[PDB]
Design a protein around this motif. Structure first.
Motif, PDB file in Angstrom:
ATOM      1  N   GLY A 193      -2.593  -4.708  19.770  1.00 38.11           N
ATOM      2  CA  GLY A 193      -2.659  -5.789  19.350  1.00 38.11           C
ATOM      3  C   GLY A 193      -3.713  -6.086  18.100  1.00 38.11           C
ATOM      4  O   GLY A 193      -3.721  -7.248  18.481  1.00 38.11           O
ATOM      5  N   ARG A 194      -3.805  -5.722  17.409  1.00 34.29           N
ATOM      6  CA  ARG A 194      -4.643  -5.718  15.792  1.00 34.29           C
ATOM      7  C   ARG A 194      -4.073  -6.947  15.439  1.00 34.29           C
ATOM      8  O   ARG A 194      -2.885  -6.495  15.119  1.00 34.29           O
ATOM      9  N   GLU A 195      -4.496  -7.598  14.118  1.00 35.65           N
ATOM     10  CA  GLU A 195      -3.630  -8.646  13.357  1.00 35.65           C
ATOM     11  C   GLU A 195      -3.226  -7.903  12.839  1.00 35.65           C
ATOM     12  O   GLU A 195      -4.872  -7.469  11.812  1.00 35.65           O
ATOM     13  N   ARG A 196      -2.175  -7.958  12.303  1.00 35.85           N
ATOM     14  CA  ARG A 196      -1.061  -7.367  11.149  1.00 35.85           C
ATOM     15  C   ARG A 196      -1.469  -8.324   9.877  1.00 35.85           C
ATOM     16  O   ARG A 196      -2.047  -9.189   9.683  1.00 35.85           O
ATOM     17  N   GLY A 197      -2.052  -6.929   8.877  1.00 29.31           N
ATOM     18  CA  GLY A 197      -2.618  -7.094   7.833  1.00 29.31           C
ATOM     19  C   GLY A 197      -4.555  -7.032   7.646  1.00 29.31           C
ATOM     20  O   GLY A 197      -4.731  -7.607   6.632  1.00 29.31           O
ATOM     21  N   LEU A 198      -4.943  -5.996   8.476  1.00 31.34           N
ATOM     22  CA  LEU A 198      -5.566  -5.606   8.604  1.00 31.34           C
ATOM     23  C   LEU A 198      -6.970  -3.988   8.375  1.00 31.34           C
ATOM     24  O   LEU A 198      -7.551  -3.456   7.367  1.00 31.34           O
ATOM     25  N   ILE A 199      -5.277  -3.419   8.223  1.00 33.83           N
ATOM     26  CA  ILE A 199      -5.318  -1.407   8.076  1.00 33.83           C
ATOM     27  C   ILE A 199      -4.013  -1.497   6.719  1.00 33.83           C
ATOM     28  O   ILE A 199      -2.978  -2.464   7.148  1.00 33.83           O
ATOM     29  N   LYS A 200      -4.296  -1.163   5.685  1.00 36.82           N
ATOM     30  CA  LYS A 200      -2.983  -0.316   4.494  1.00 36.82           C
ATOM     31  C   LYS A 200      -2.920   0.583   4.802  1.00 36.82           C
ATOM     32  O   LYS A 200      -3.084   1.473   4.455  1.00 36.82           O
ATOM     33  N   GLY A 201      -1.357   0.844   5.961  1.00 34.63           N
ATOM     34  CA  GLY A 201      -1.210   2.804   6.050  1.00 34.63           C
ATOM     35  C   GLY A 201      -0.416   2.230   7.275  1.00 34.63           C
ATOM     36  O   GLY A 201       0.606   1.154   7.291  1.00 34.63           O
ATOM     37  N   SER A 202       0.036   3.169   7.385  1.00 38.86           N
ATOM     38  CA  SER A 202       2.015   3.845   7.591  1.00 38.86           C
ATOM     39  C   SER A 202       0.911   3.205   9.666  1.00 38.86           C
ATOM     40  O   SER A 202       2.567   2.901   9.588  1.00 38.86           O
ATOM     41  N   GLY A 210       0.655  -1.275  -0.107  1.00 40.78           N
ATOM     42  CA  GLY A 210       0.301   0.011  -0.142  1.00 40.78           C
ATOM     43  C   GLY A 210       1.105   1.290   0.007  1.00 40.78           C
ATOM     44  O   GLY A 210       2.035   1.267   0.208  1.00 40.78           O
ATOM     45  N   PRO A 211       0.064   2.171  -0.405  1.00 35.66           N
ATOM     46  CA  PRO A 211       0.856   3.499  -0.050  1.00 35.66           C
ATOM     47  C   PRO A 211       1.421   3.934   1.352  1.00 35.66           C
ATOM     48  O   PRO A 211       0.533   3.891   2.624  1.00 35.66           O
ATOM     49  N   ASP A 212       2.484   3.819   1.502  1.00 32.90           N
ATOM     50  CA  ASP A 212       3.444   4.766   2.333  1.00 32.90           C
ATOM     51  C   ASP A 212       3.128   6.354   2.439  1.00 32.90           C
ATOM     52  O   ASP A 212       4.363   6.961   2.277  1.00 32.90           O
ATOM     53  N   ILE A 213       2.106   6.757   3.241  1.00 34.60           N
ATOM     54  CA  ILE A 213       2.174   8.264   3.018  1.00 34.60           C
ATOM     55  C   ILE A 213       3.173   8.202   4.483  1.00 34.60           C
ATOM     56  O   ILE A 213       3.171  10.089   3.803  1.00 34.60           O
ATOM     57  N   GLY A 214       3.117   7.705   5.843  1.00 35.52           N
ATOM     58  CA  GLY A 214       3.927   8.361   6.832  1.00 35.52           C
ATOM     59  C   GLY A 214       5.428   8.152   6.251  1.00 35.52           C
ATOM     60  O   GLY A 214       5.990   9.202   6.760  1.00 35.52           O
ATOM     61  N   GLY A 215       5.457   7.783   5.375  1.00 38.09           N
ATOM     62  CA  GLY A 215       6.817   7.821   5.256  1.00 38.09           C
ATOM     63  C   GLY A 215       8.112   7.484   5.812  1.00 38.09           C
ATOM     64  O   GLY A 215       9.246   7.018   5.022  1.00 38.09           O
ATOM     65  N   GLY A 216       7.308   6.397   6.598  1.00 42.16           N
ATOM     66  CA  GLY A 216       8.349   5.121   6.653  1.00 42.16           C
ATOM     67  C   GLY A 216       8.258   3.514   6.407  1.00 42.16           C
ATOM     68  O   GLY A 216       9.568   2.882   6.950  1.00 42.16           O
ATOM     69  N   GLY A 217       8.075   3.720   5.925  1.00 44.57           N
ATOM     70  CA  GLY A 217       7.781   2.498   4.317  1.00 44.57           C
ATOM     71  C   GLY A 217       9.334   2.502   3.970  1.00 44.57           C
ATOM     72  O   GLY A 217       9.930   1.974   3.567  1.00 44.57           O
ATOM     73  N   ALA A 218       9.703   3.839   3.839  1.00 44.31           N
ATOM     74  CA  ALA A 218      10.990   4.191   2.909  1.00 44.31           C
ATOM     75  C   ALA A 218      11.843   4.125   3.190  1.00 44.31           C
ATOM     76  O   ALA A 218      13.215   3.321   2.452  1.00 44.31           O
ATOM     77  N   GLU A 219      12.074   4.141   4.361  1.00 46.41           N
ATOM     78  CA  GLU A 219      13.572   4.251   5.268  1.00 46.41           C
ATOM     79  C   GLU A 219      13.190   2.218   5.764  1.00 46.41           C
ATOM     80  O   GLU A 219      14.017   2.430   5.148  1.00 46.41           O
ATOM     81  N   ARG A 220      11.985   1.253   5.311  1.00 49.18           N
ATOM     82  CA  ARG A 220      12.195  -0.040   5.870  1.00 49.18           C
ATOM     83  C   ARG A 220      12.923  -0.353   4.170  1.00 49.18           C
ATOM     84  O   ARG A 220      13.498  -1.622   4.277  1.00 49.18           O
ATOM     85  N   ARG A 258       3.606   6.610 -10.446  1.00 48.05           N
ATOM     86  CA  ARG A 258       2.654   7.288 -10.403  1.00 48.05           C
ATOM     87  C   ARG A 258       2.210   8.364  -9.088  1.00 48.05           C
ATOM     88  O   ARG A 258       2.179   9.048  -9.371  1.00 48.05           O
ATOM     89  N   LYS A 259       2.378   6.936  -8.118  1.00 45.15           N
ATOM     90  CA  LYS A 259       1.688   7.450  -7.058  1.00 45.15           C
ATOM     91  C   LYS A 259       2.105   7.877  -6.012  1.00 45.15           C
ATOM     92  O   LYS A 259       1.907   9.056  -5.605  1.00 45.15           O
ATOM     93  N   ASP A 260       3.633   7.613  -5.907  1.00 47.69           N
ATOM     94  CA  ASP A 260       4.982   8.095  -5.282  1.00 47.69           C
ATOM     95  C   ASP A 260       5.030   8.841  -5.891  1.00 47.69           C
ATOM     96  O   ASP A 260       6.460   9.230  -7.258  1.00 47.69           O
ATOM     97  N   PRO A 261       5.635  10.375  -5.728  1.00 50.39           N
ATOM     98  CA  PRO A 261       6.280  11.694  -6.021  1.00 50.39           C
ATOM     99  C   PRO A 261       8.005  11.079  -5.991  1.00 50.39           C
ATOM    100  O   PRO A 261       8.343  11.791  -6.907  1.00 50.39           O
ATOM    101  N   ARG A 262       8.546  10.445  -4.832  1.00 50.38           N
ATOM    102  CA  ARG A 262       9.745   9.689  -5.855  1.00 50.38           C
ATOM    103  C   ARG A 262       9.790   9.303  -6.656  1.00 50.38           C
ATOM    104  O   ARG A 262      10.939   9.130  -6.867  1.00 50.38           O
ATOM    105  N   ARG A 263       8.866   8.420  -6.353  1.00 51.84           N
ATOM    106  CA  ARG A 263       8.823   7.533  -7.335  1.00 51.84           C
ATOM    107  C   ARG A 263       9.018   8.303  -9.153  1.00 51.84           C
ATOM    108  O   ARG A 263       9.650   7.868  -9.815  1.00 51.84           O
ATOM    109  N   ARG A 264       7.711   8.998  -9.148  1.00 57.18           N
ATOM    110  CA  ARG A 264       7.229   9.688  -9.997  1.00 57.18           C
ATOM    111  C   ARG A 264       8.726   9.881 -10.603  1.00 57.18           C
ATOM    112  O   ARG A 264       9.420  10.814 -11.894  1.00 57.18           O
TER     113      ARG A 264
END
Lengths: 327, 352, 240, 498, 369, 209, 39
Positions: free
Chosen positions: E117-126, B73-83, C74-80
């Motif tokens: 303690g939510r199971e991993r893989g239930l929300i797609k975000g940072s 998914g899209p890493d909006i927080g930016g920690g995915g880039a560090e990962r 096209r989603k990530d500006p760094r990738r873009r």
């Protein structure tokens, strides 16, 4: 980084010989049965007339207000121009190809061609506003300093408030003063339904123009006029008969430029200057076929009959559709 | 390494560290990743340089899923880039291992697989991907007798027989489960001030560890006679049907009416070996499925059915649909239909 | 030039023999570390193409382009920014690059490859930017025999070893897989105290991998007792 | 954080009106505020927090200000929207600062306007959200750690109870929950008395009728009523507020301002006039003959106001008759709803128009509500169905709020299984609608003279009154020929003077 | 930072304990008699988890067990771990467990583990990745590597199904104790302890108050104590009696009693409705014990109501007879029966439309149940 | 920029028939909108034929007139174009008729029996319960009103066949026609117009008072 | 799933409205499938 490369696009002014060569240009092979007659395209004629009027400084003298004669001549001329916009928008990027017409019309324009990019104003994220304002006012001052010149702004849809303010004050101020009125601010995009209604005023970026897909006669005409301009004369057997009309495809822009370049390369490797049927066939085969190792053929004849029958039916019955090669 | 949670991966890593006699480098997955970029890569490359300096070495990284998580998914927080920076830095350090100078062995350990990115598992980085699964009956016996060395029992023979008999009913349990059964039995014995682990302590540890109780309240409730009667009649009907229709693998052993459940509280003597089951076995299972509704309709009438005992012929319905559709010795046909969508509208009246 | 196919087929060998037989400088990088950090996002592509131009005519070869030209660029500006830099260096158009389109310094061939050809963008595989596509596939039986001979030349083979009777058991194996198979046979050769590696070592390695494939890790003793645990008639049914 | 420390807030309990129950409940808070000693000797735990929940413009902030004024304690006002920032932790610091400044001058009152701004529920349908959660945590920590013996009462004003977190509703933080109902007829009367003392008033203005005829209007809306009346009198250069200017403010804020010369064709106005006059005539006839429990016509207009090209005004009855809606009352109201189409069918013969479509949809939905939802008939039905279309209850057009509302099922719907009874329900609804349509057209067709004369008079005058409609009905008895109207020198002439 | 001072709550301060209290003192035994525990060879179970309805005072149990254990008490909200930034939460958990290990012997408390303690893989975000990192860090500091044998964690959750089964693995969270809603005696003792700080009487019977407010949490009982202080100064009596408690419970379970203007026929209609309900209920076994019958409108209900207290054991377990539902549907339909039999068929009202749909919904649930 | 087809009579014949039929059916409906200009634009993306129509609370009769007008190009192409050469030109109109008829059955209640049954609203997302076998009845009603409008259009279009042929050939030979020219054609060649009151079915028509 | 908290007031229902909701959707889907796959 863009300001340096757009400042150095003309460090020295055009020489007298260059300007004199450009000022006496001609029609160059429209009236041929093979390529691009008069009635085929009206929009390019209008753009050609606009850039020609821009070339001869025929826009700063906006009117005459004389007794009867020059006024009548000017009214007739303004009729003939359309059927004097200082800024024209073109919205035709539904198919393919954007620069393929702009540089094709600007190669004989002899004026500095500056293409400012709006995406540079987005990636800069009270110090950003000052830097952006100085940058955009330097671009506009450089564009004024390069007068006469043509400004091209592709992909308006990327537009943010500071550039909007710059554009609105530029199109509100530099159309009744700033003596070089012939400053074209041509622009192109692919979505016309998202632009704000404040940028479509008659005094602000009017006269929208569309560009559509390429039909088969237009494909033949564009291919011929692209091959002829490089000293390569089309052989008088495929455009003289129904030879290469039945095999040509790529009904889009930027698909004929690559085909033309491949065919010219194939003829150059043979040290030839004419293009036969075999060269076109070998150029078409090199674009829609994938090179592959571990080659294997069909081990059950019986799908061959399927292809043979479908090709024969598509040949005889539908006489206006292509046939891909069978293998 | 990967597998079920709490199967002994950390114990295996500690065993590797102990028996290797090589410079061991224990690390953590989420130790490196932070908000500020460059910290994770610098830490990991310092670790890699240290392991190269002390070659041969055993670098172990617990829970690679923290940094090895695939982009989902899209890493909006930016920690995915560090990962990803840390992950690709680990990949470059792994690919920088020349076979003539770097005798560094990487030992991974993870509890999840589907969230990992399929570039670490590629060639040259993670060649061996082993999995420590649930141990067999001999493996369960071995782990319980390993965990019962310090554990005081009445006698060695009594300890051995208790360990074997608890090994026969601890199926589908990992090493942590058996170790916690022994631990809870020790807790019970120390609470009751008994110096040795009795049989009933093992029984109570097993009763707790499979989660039979779910209410978790003060079990002091005056049960009406109308409820004891219903439970006794249901259990007696189950006993009568099971004795009259003998199941060759699950004989009835114990029967209680002390609990309220959707299913009867009966106990069967499980004997493994169900390779085959005839059509008569399916018919007998269908008959045994709908016992409580019939017994309550017979003795107590239709207007006295419970909400639970009337929800018993539904399982008979599911079993009969299974017999007709997914077994194929009926006259419905000789095909295998999965109930979802390969049921064309012609076969629906036949099935009904 | 876009190379495609399964990974591990030796896609680097094609580029390396390209450089060797052509006799040119060969600019080579990897596309993983191009979305590195904030110090230089798209500047690595620009300095890459500048080094290529300064040593032109030459080749440009980039690995794992799907990490740059993927469908989520096209989603990530760094990738873009990286994708825009790559697609701008891919063509001429003197502005923003400051060099004549037709020149010796612009005689650069851009070689790119991935493992997922359908994951790339529609505007990157367009003709004019990516013209030719080469699809390299897995080898067949005779090439597998030759690779088995090549990667096991420096090992002490027996007289009964012959890989021609196990070609049907190694369908879909790559060169890395055959190398791993030879190393596997050597390890279970030295584990059993054997001096050489017969055919039975390879057979046992393949069989143990197949057994492990469904998640069965059992030594001989536990397998024997578990076979003895099952009764006779219910094994007689599985026998028929 | 300039929390205004005012020794006298300027408003007392005499400045609040229509909030009698809530101020009576808060009198306990005032008694605690003025002298807590007798509270402390017997051992009360005072409410840690009191939450004022109600519609906007009801003066909950004014209520708290009056509480502080009568109690003689400093009033700390700073809204919930003042707790939102970009930086993290500043809002919790402001919470701590406001709380400790309250603990300085004990007793004191803390008031947070729009508390739901900081207390938005974590709905499961940037760093600012983390700031909101930290401010909520700090506020709940300060509330739970508040000893009740020091007498610092915290007030929270909110507009919506649903978005507020249930953690604050737990006892120990918000012990008291007070609803601030919109003022009643006496409450709006008293608010009109208070607000009319600030502007010059004439003796011809009767505020009782305005209080009775403007239901559910908040105190701020009565304030804007009197202010726009003052501005209208300024526009007319009136020396005082006349009844005409007050009614002008009424029609300006209810239906909207009158346009200038914006009229459609003569056919575009005859149809709307016919529809509205037919609805009014059906309502008046049902009142006259069968003595229905329905409303009364006030005035009918075809002058465009706001976004309504024509309007008919209906009075609102007392809510005690709005609970047990019987079958005959619903049938007569439903006849009133088809009165428009009855008018188009009798006047134009068979060429109806689109001006009466909304009334048709309302009749069709209330027939279903009679059948399925309320189950008023006596074949028993197994399920009700929700309305496919929803139109909010609104102004002068037909009331459609006799049972609170029309297009609001009371969660009385279930998904159907049998599809053979759905058609029998549809046939029953069609039979009811068709029979009721024949009855309303038969009753309206019996009086064509009164209908036609009312249409002509309203077309000439562009506005008619209920008393004028009654006069036309009395002067035109049933079964008189249309030639009697047609022989008059002016059919659109009204000889009655109000 | 996460250390609290002045933890004096004991087991006497908390009521409604039951046999769970035994487990609680077992925890105290784990903190006192652990020498013979490890002498026999028992590893102290670190993970104890209290699960139950909100408002029962799980954090109050945490303070009680910490005070009785006589060790350092850490009480950390789990909402601080989740953040828009990554890595900082893992460092927070690291510092928490490091200062817990340094302050050994100690007990640490974390409440509402469902947030982290939510199971991993239930929300797609940072935020999901940060939650995964914090869960991994707490997992490692719980069981990952050796170094803890003295620090014991106590936790309080509401929904046990949301938790990661990796956390539920024995050695991390193996003791699972459910705190049920207080019964009859539990409500009695909770009311007693929450009312010890106020002057009460000797004729004050909590049996009627406990039987009146059935099926409520301890926070609701504390609320009943809180509405035992504010409402007697209207009349000004001497000492608190059980009548005030009964009226406070009646106010709390329904709402405040407000009086509005009303006609005679409206009162007659509400009266015949309530009469229909009570009269049809008294002849049926499951709804025979009608105790209250009023037509006074309350908050949210302009109707009256009939109060019955049937047996609450068969209802929860599901042992209700088929006839027990055919009787209830008749009860819901009987308001319409009285309306039809009194006002005729042509004058049916809309006041019984709330029971007439409950009857049909119950019938629908019966036929496909 | 380029026309997609040449300027031959075999190409412009379907478009001339289309435009002439639409103009004629506009002319023959009384108190309807007025057709102003007809021409054959060689480079129009909508089609070769172009027709200008200027409109004159729409009542039931106006919607009926629009519905019967929506059949003109289709029916004209039916009498005029030879078999073996059909068109997809009138389709965008015929579905419009498929849109128009249901509106008098569901929305406005102008059904075949003048029933006040309403099952659809302007802001509605779906319809009512509608039954299961009750849908066949209203479907038959909608097909009935659609066929009634179709037969009205056919009856009042087949009586001006020669006028339609005249308009087609004048459009083909002049490429520009005006309202005055159409009036002259329908006057010389004997065009018959319809007369008020205009109804699709006279079995339930009444007169205003 | 039968509304485990007993109703003290008879006005409240013995079953939650969302108890038997998947079966209603299952029956509706089956009937709609039978209706669509017959015409």
């Amino acid at each position: 980084r863009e300001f340096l490369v757009q400042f150095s696009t003309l460090r020295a002014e055009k020489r007298i010989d260059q300007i004199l060569l450009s000022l006496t240009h001609s029609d160059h092979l429209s009236k041929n049965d093979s390529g691009y007659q008069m009635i085929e395209q009206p929009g390019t004629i209008y753009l050609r007339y606009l850039v020609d009027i821009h070339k001869k400084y025929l826009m700063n003298y906006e009117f005459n207000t004389s007794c009867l004669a020059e006024r009548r001549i000017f009214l007739a001329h303004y009729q003939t121009i359309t059927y004097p916009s200082r800024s024209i928008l073109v919205i035709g990027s539904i198919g393919t190809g954007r620069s393929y017409l702009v540089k094709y019309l600007a190669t004989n324009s002899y004026v500095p061609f500056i293409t400012v990019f709006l995406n540079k104003f987005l990636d800069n994220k009270d110090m950003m506003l000052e830097i952006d304002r100085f940058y955009i006012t330097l671009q506009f001052e450089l564009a004024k300093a390069m007068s006469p010149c043509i400004i091209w702004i592709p992909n308006i849809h990327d537009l943010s408030y500071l550039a909007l303010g710059l554009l609105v004050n530029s199109l509100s101020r530099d159309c009744e003063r700033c003596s070089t009125r012939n400053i074209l601010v041509i622009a192109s995009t692919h979505i016309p339904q998202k632009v704000d209604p404040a940028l479509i005023a008659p005094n602000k970026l009017n006269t929208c123009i569309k560009i559509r897909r390429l039909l088969i006669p237009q494909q033949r005409k564009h291919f011929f006029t692209l091959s002829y301009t490089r000293g390569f004369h089309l052989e008088k057997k495929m455009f003289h008969t129904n030879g290469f009309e039945s095999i040509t495809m790529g009904s889009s822009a930027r698909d004929l430029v690559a085909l033309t370049n491949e065919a010219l390369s194939i003829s150059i490797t043979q040290k030839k200057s004419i293009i036969d049927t075999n060269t076109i066939r070998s150029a078409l085969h090199r674009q829609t076929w994938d090179l592959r190792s571990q080659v294997r053929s069909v081990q059950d004849h019986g799908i061959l009959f399927y292809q043979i029958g479908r090709a024969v039916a598509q040949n005889v019955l539908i006489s206006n559709c292509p046939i891909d090669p069978i293998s | 390494l990967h597998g079920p949670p709490g199967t002994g991966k950390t114990l295996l890593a500690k065993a590797i560290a102990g028996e290797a006699g090589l410079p061991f480098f224990a690390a953590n997955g989420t130790d490196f990743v932070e908000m500020f970029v460059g910290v994770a890569a610098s830490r990991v490359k310092d670790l890699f340089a240290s392991s190269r300096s002390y070659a041969p070495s055993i670098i172990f990284i617990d829970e690679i899923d923290a940094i090895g998580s695939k982009r989902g998914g899209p890493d909006i927080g930016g920690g995915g880039a560090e990962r990803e920076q840390g992950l690709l830095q680990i990949l470059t350090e792994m690919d920088g291992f020349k076979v003539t100078t770097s005798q560094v062995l990487v030992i991974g350990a993870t509890n999840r697989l589907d969230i990992l990115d399929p570039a670490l598992l590629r060639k040259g980085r993670f060649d061996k991907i082993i999995r420590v699964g649930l141990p067999s009956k001999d493996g369960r016996l071995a782990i319980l007798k390993v965990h019962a060395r310090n554990k005081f029992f009445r006698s060695e023979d009594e300890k051995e027989e208790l360990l074997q008999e608890v090994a026969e009913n601890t199926e589908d349990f990992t090493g942590a489960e058996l170790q916690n059964v022994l631990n809870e039995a020790g807790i019970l014995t120390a609470r009751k001030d008994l110096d040795y682990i009795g049989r009933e302590e093992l029984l109570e540890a097993l009763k707790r560890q499979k989660g039979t109780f779910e209410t978790g309240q003060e079990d002091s409730t005056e049960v009406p006679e109308e409820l004891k009667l219903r439970l006794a009649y249901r259990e007696a009907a189950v006993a009568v049907l099971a004795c009259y229709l003998p199941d060759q693998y699950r004989p009835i052993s114990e029967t209680d009416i002390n609990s309220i459940r959707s299913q009867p509280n009966m106990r069967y003597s499980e004997t493994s070996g169900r390779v085959f089951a005839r059509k008569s076995d399916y018919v007998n299972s269908i008959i045994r499925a709908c016992a409580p509704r019939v017994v309550e309709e017979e003795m107590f009438g239709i207007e006295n059915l419970c909400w639970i005992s009337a929800k018993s012929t539904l399982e008979a319905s599911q079993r009969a649909e299974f017999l007709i559709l997914q077994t194929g010795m009926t006259a419905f046909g000789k095909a295998y239909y999965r109930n979802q969508r390969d049921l064309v509208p012609n076969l629906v009246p036949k099935l009904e | 030039v876009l190379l495609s196919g399964p990974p591990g087929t030796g896609k680097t060998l094609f580029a390396r023999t390209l450089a060797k037989e052509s006799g040119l400088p060969f600019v080579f990088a990897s596309g993983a570390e191009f979305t590195d950090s904030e110090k230089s996002g798209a500047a690595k592509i620009n300095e890459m193409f500048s080094i290529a131009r300064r040593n032109a005519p030459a080749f440009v070869f980039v690995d794992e382009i799907d990490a740059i030209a993927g469908r989520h660029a096209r989603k990530d500006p760094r990738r873009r920014a990286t994708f825009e830099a790559l697609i701008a260096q891919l063509d001429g158009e003197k502005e923003k690059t400051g060099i004549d389109r037709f020149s010796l310094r612009q005689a650069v061939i851009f070689i790119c490859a991935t493992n997922r050809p359908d994951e790339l963008d529609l505007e990157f595989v367009r003709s004019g930017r990516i013209d030719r596509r080469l699809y390299i596939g897995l080898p067949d039986a005779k090439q597998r025999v030759q690779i088995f001979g090549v990667h096991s030349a420096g090992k002490n083979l027996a007289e009964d070893i012959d890989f021609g009777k196990l070609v049907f058991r190694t369908v879909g194996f790559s060169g890395a897989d055959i190398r791993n198979l030879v190393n596997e046979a050597a390890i279970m050769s030295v584990r059993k105290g054997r001096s050489y590696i017969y055919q039975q070592d390879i057979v046992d390695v393949l069989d143990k991998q197949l057994l492990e494939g469904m998640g069965v890790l059992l030594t001989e003793e536990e397998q024997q007792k578990c076979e003895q645990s099952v009764s006779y008639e219910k094994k007689r049914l599985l026998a028929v | 954080a300039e929390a205004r420390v005012d020794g006298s807030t300027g408003v007392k309990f005499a400045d609040v009106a229509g909030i009698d129950e809530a101020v009576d409940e808060l009198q306990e808070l005032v008694k605690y505020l003025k002298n807590p000693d007798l509270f402390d000797k017997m051992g009360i735990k005072p409410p840690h927090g009191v939450l004022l929940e109600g519609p906007p413009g009801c003066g909950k902030t004014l209520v708290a200000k009056a509480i502080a004024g009568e109690a003689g304690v400093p009033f700390y006002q700073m809204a919930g929207s003042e707790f939102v920032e970009v930086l993290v932790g500043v809002g919790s610091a402001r919470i701590r600062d406001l709380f400790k400044r309250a603990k300085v001058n004990k007793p004191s009152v803390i008031f947070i306007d729009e508390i739901d701004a900081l207390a938005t529920r974590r709905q499961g349908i940037n760093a600012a959200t983390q700031e909101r959660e930290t401010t909520l945590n700090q506020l709940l920590i300060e509330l739970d750690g508040f000893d009740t013996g020091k007498g610092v009462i915290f007030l929270g004003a909110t507009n919506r109870r649903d978005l507020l977190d249930p953690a604050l509703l737990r006892p120990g933080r918000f012990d008291r929950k007070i609803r601030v109902r919109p003022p009643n007829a006496k409450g709006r009367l008293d608010i009109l008395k208070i607000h009319a003392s600030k502007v010059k008033m004439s003796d011809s203005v009767d505020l009782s009728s305005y209080a009775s005829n403007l239901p559910g209007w908040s105190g701020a809306k009565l304030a804007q009523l009197v202010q726009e009346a003052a501005l209208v009198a300024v526009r007319k250069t009136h020396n005082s507020i006349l009844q005409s200017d007050m009614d002008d403010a009424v029609d300006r804020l209810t239906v909207g301002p009158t346009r200038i010369g914006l009229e459609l064709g003569h056919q575009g106005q005859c149809r709307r006039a016919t529809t509205e006059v037919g609805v009014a005539i059906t309502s008046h006839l049902l009142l006259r003959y069968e003595n229905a429990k329905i409303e009364r016509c006030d005035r009918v207009s075809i002058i465009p106001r706001g976004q309504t090209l024509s309007q008919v005004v209906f009075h609102r009855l007392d809510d005690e008759s709005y609970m047990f809606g019987r079958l005959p009352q619903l049938l007569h109201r439903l006849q009133v709803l088809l009165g428009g189409r009855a008018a188009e069918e009798v006047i134009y013969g068979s060429d109806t128009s689109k001006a009466s479509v909304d009334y048709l949809s309302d009749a069709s939905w209330l027939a279903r509500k009679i059948l399925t939802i309320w189950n008023l008939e006596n074949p028993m039905v197994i399920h009700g169905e929700p309305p496919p279309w929803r139109k909010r209850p609104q102004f002068v057009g037909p009331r459609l709020d006799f049972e609170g509302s029309l297009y609001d099922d009371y969660d009385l719907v279930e998904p159907p299984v049998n599809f053979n009874m759905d058609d029998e329900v549809a046939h029953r609804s069609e039979e009811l609608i068709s029979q009721m349509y024949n009855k309303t057209v038969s009753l309206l067709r019996q009086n064509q003279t009164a209908l036609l004369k009312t249409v002509k008079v309203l077309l000439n005058q562009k506005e008619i009154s209920g008393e004028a409609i009654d006069f036309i009905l009395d002067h035109y008895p049933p079964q008189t020929p249309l030639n009697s109207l047609l022989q008059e020198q002016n059919p659109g002439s009204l000889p009655f003077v109000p | 930072e996460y250390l609290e001072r002045g933890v004096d709550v004991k087991f006497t301060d908390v009521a409604g304990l039951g046999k769970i209290r035994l487990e609680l003192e077992e925890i105290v035994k784990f903190f006192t008699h652990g020498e013979m525990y490890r002498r026999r060879g028992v590893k102290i179970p670190g993970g104890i988890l209290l699960c139950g309805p909100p408002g029962v005072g799980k954090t109050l149990l945490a303070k009680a067990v910490a005070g009785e254990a006589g060790v350092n008490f850490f009480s950390i909200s789990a909402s601080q771990f989740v953040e828009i930034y990554v890595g900082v939460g893992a460092s927070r958990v690291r510092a928490l467990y490091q200062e817990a290990r340094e302050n050994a012997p100690s007990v640490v408390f974390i409440d509402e583990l469902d947030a982290v303690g939510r199971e991993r893989g239930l929300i797609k975000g940072s935020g999901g990745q940060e939650r995964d990192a914090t869960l991994n860090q707490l997992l490692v500091s719980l069981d990952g590597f050796e170094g803890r044998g003295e620090v014991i964690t106590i936790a309080s959750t509401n929904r046990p199904d949301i938790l990661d089964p990796a956390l539920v693995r024995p050695g991390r969270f193996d003791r699972k104790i459910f705190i049920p809603k207080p019964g009859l005696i539990g409500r009695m003792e909770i009311l007693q302890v929450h009312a010890r700080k106020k002057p009460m009487a000797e004729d004050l019977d909590y049996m009627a108050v406990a039987s009146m407010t059935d099926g409520m949490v301890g926070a609701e009982l504390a609320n009943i104590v809180e509405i035992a202080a504010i409402n007697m100064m209207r009349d000004g009596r001497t000492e608190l009696t059980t009548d005030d408690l009964l009226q406070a419970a009646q106010i709390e379970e329904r709402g405040m009693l407000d009086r509005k203007d009303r006609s005679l026929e409206t009162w007659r209609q509400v009266a015949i409705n309530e009469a229909a309900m009570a009269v049809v209920a008294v002849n049926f076994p499951d709804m025979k014990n009608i105790e209250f019958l009023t037509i006074n409108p309350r908050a949210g209900r302009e109707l009256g109501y009939v109060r019955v207290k049937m047996d609450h054991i068969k209802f929860k377990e599901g042992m209700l007879s088929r006839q027990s539902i055919l009787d209830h549907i008749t009860v819901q339909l009987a308001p319409r029966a009285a309306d039809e039999l009194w006002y005729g068929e042509d004058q049916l009202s809309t006041i019984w439309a709330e029971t007439s749909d409950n009857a049909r919904s119950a019938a629908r649930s019966l036929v496909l149940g | 920029l380029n026309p997609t087809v040449d300027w031959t009579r075999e190409t412009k014949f379907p478009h001339a028939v289309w435009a002439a039929g639409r103009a004629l059916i506009t002319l023959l409906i009384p108190n309807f909108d007025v057709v102003e200009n007809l021409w054959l634009e060689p480079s129009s993306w909508e089609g070769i034929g172009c027709t200008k129509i200027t409109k004159v609370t729409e009542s039931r009769s106006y919607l009926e007139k629009k519905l019967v007008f929506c059949f003109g190009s289709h029916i004209a192409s039916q009498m005029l174009l030879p078999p073996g050469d059909e068109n997809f030109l009138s389709s965008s109109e015929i579905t419009k008729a498929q849109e128009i008829a249901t509106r008098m059955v569901l929305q406005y209640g102008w059904g075949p029996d003048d029933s006040p049954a309403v099952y659809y609203a302007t802001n509605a997302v779906s319809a009512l319960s509608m039954g299961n076998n009750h849908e066949y009845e209203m479907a038959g009603k909608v097909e009935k009103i659609y066929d009634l409008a179709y037969e009205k259009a056919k009856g009042m279009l087949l009586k001006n066949r020669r006028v339609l042929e005249k308009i087609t050939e004048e459009l083909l030979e002049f490429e520009i026609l005006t309202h005055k020219d159409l009036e002259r054609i329908v006057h010389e060649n004997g065009g018959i117009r319809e007369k008020e009151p205009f109804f699709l079915s006279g079995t339930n028509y009444n007169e205003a008072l | 799933t039968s509304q485990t908290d007993p109703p003290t007031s008879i006005y409240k229902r013995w079953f939650i409205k969302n108890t038997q909701e998947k079966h209603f959707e299952l029956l509706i889907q089956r009937q709609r499938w039978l209706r669509t796959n017959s015409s």
